[PDB]
Amino acid sequence: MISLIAALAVDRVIGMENAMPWNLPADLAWFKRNTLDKPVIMGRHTWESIGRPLPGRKNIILSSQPGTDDRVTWVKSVDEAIAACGDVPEIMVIGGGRVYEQFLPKAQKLYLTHIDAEVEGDTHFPDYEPDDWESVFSEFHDADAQNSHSYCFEILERR
């Protein structure tokens, strides 16, 4: 099963100029917890932005070009990246926009963080059919001294 995980602000903005504007620690903790010990798939721009491999997970990078770093697994196709994960129970796709659009149709679960913030970005999460997904879990949180905005964690599963 494939899952997608993303943090979205107002207007489904996921990012601006390859960066996440906000500071949400609670959000980092949710991501880590949901991805630990699972393979993660990401697009080359995302990888660039991360700089080093996420520890405790198999890092698969999608790019059309040959890889340039032996610490991660390079693949050139969606199907290739899925095969590189082997027989694990859940594959986590981590962005960016172009990757999420591609994996959406195959995904069975979406882990989303809706952040109450207004930012301008150049990329948006794919517009998905809400009728096709069931909201199985949802927990809202008010801003606090560590978290500057309110946010809500949500998990959806494809009907």
Ligand X SMILES: NC(=O)c1ccc[n+]([C@@H]2O[C@H](COP(=O)([O-])OP(=O)(O)OC[C@H]3O[C@@H](n4cnc5c(N)ncnc54)[C@H](OP(=O)(O)O)[C@@H]3O)[C@@H](O)[C@H]2O)c1
Q: Is 51 in the site for ligand X (CB under 6 A)?
A: no
Dihedral Cα 10, 14, 19, 23, nearest 10 deg: 60
The Cα–Cα gap between 69 and 154 comes to 34
Give the contact letters, 81-120, x = binds to ligand X (CB under 6 A), - = no: -------------xxxxxx--x------------------
Cβ atoms of 155 and 52 closer than 8 Å: no
Q: Write down the least CB distance from residue 34 to ligand X, Å.
A: 12
Q: Write down the least CB distance from residue 19 to ligand X, Å.
A: 5
Q: Is 143 left (phi over 0), alpha (psi -120 to 50) or beta?
A: beta
Q: Is 14 in the site for ligand X (CB under 6 A)?
A: yes
Binding site for ligand X (CB under 6 A): 6-7, 14-16, 18-20, 42-46, 62-65, 76-78, 94-99, 102, 123
